[PDB]
Amino acid sequence: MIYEGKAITVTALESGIVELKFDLKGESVNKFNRLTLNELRQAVDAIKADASVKGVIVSSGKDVFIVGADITEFVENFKLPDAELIAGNLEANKIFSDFEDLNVPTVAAINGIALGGGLEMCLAADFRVMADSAKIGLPEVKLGIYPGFGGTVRLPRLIGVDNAVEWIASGKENRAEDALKVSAVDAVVTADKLGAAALDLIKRAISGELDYKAKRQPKLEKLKLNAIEQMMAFETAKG
């Protein structure tokens, strides 16, 4: 195949479209540990070279989609000097950013729970399909921190300042219904039909039906809010 690791598998599909599944063999769930970050890196650089690629569908092999990294590694990482820590995320965000700047339509098939980095992964893609029985959120504040994988960057520009501030300041989980209303997700479908949901969406992006270049732009530019509107948008939020 195009790529094969211990937590990520990139299998080719029809019409050039290729699927990138997060399946951490051995463990029960998926999370961004030291390994996954490196494998995703290689996976991206692989799709970044393969010219036969016409689209990318990110799926999950486990029950849940992708949850936060091991709490154990968090502590170990929060002891390092500030300079070494920032470098860890500076290079980390680069991975997601690369998958974002990928000159090809990308869609995430959220079949299950997508928390912390998991949601940030999807936020990097262009479109997002979610199963009605799933939940997404950013429970970073439940640890005294906030989204470090571009979360505080893509969400505010995707669903709006206010709604983003809420999703972050609370760290609450979000149901399928609410996720769509805030546009954190582009479409909700039954679990079984979630498969074709992504495939059908991809083809409607490649042809040009769904301008993916225009849908990706918002999170690559300044907020649409006015300067005056910002003054209130944030100050009131702070207060």
Binding site: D162, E229, Q230
Partner: protein, 390 residues
Amino acid sequence: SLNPRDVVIVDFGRTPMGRSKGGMHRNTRAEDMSAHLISKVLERNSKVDPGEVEDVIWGCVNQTLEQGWNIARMASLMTQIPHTSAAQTVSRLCGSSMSALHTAAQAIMTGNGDVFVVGGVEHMGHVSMMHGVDPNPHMSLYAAKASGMMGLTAEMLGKMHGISREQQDAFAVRSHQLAHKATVEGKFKDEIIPMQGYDENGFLKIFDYDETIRPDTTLESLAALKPAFNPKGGTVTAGTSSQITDGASCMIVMSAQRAKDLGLEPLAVIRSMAVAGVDPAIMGYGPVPATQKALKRAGLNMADIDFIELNEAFAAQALPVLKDLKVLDKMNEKVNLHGGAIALGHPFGCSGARISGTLLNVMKQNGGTFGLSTMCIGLGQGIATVFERV
């Protein structure tokens, strides 16, 4: 002289204001309140024929339940207005009623009607402003959700133009004071239409005054109040803001030519109409953009207007407007001399023509000529009008 195509205001009328909470209108529908007022104002002007009324443009905001399904027609049917007449409900939040006046005026100037009946109503007691409100998440992607809360948009301006608490409460007392003063000295008599209502015990009696006016308002009584929107650092309170009040306001309008035919003496003549927009976060600054576009379309200046009626939304929004209008030092001389919305209440749908009508009386009562009726609108909007006494 007056060209036949100009607009003429025959008479103005308004229902006695009343607290939405257990007030005099606690048992009166917004529909019946309007129909009753419209019918009464038509009686004082027995010269104009209800049948000639081309269209009845009413003002209303929270159109649902009692105020839903085109209340403009639901009220015109319980009056002397024939079923042959039309009726539309114009909504532009606070400036709803005023926009209605423009729709008719412009309908006259274009030969699409000779006689109109404009006005507005808003029974916040029944159809509260917080009833049936479904916020749009996507709105946060283009603006600040906080900009929706009128109270906070007042705070921002109160900080931008530096308006202190000692100043806001000072403007509040002025409103209650002048409102009560004008009331006692009989100045609202020509506009207030005696209306049946109920008191505390539930007795049936007719009110001809305004409950909303609290004479016992002092700088000390307001200073004891706490910020209603922003806890730590707030300056605007329920005392400086307008009141939740049930009430309507009617106004008979027609062409000047038809006025010379029915031999009825006008009350004022519309000269310029204007509407403008501002940032939702600071909607209180809407009056200035509207006034400017108004004076320009009338070939006048702020110095030509003898009297001004600025709807008192918040104390933290009115003052800033009057300051940037270069008429703040002329407040006690030509601005809300009979009282403001802070003491007379602010019926989302009635306030439009309500202040415009009161303005005409302030001019007629003091030999004025040019008047200014402006008001700020939610989500960043403003509207103004200039009437001439001739």
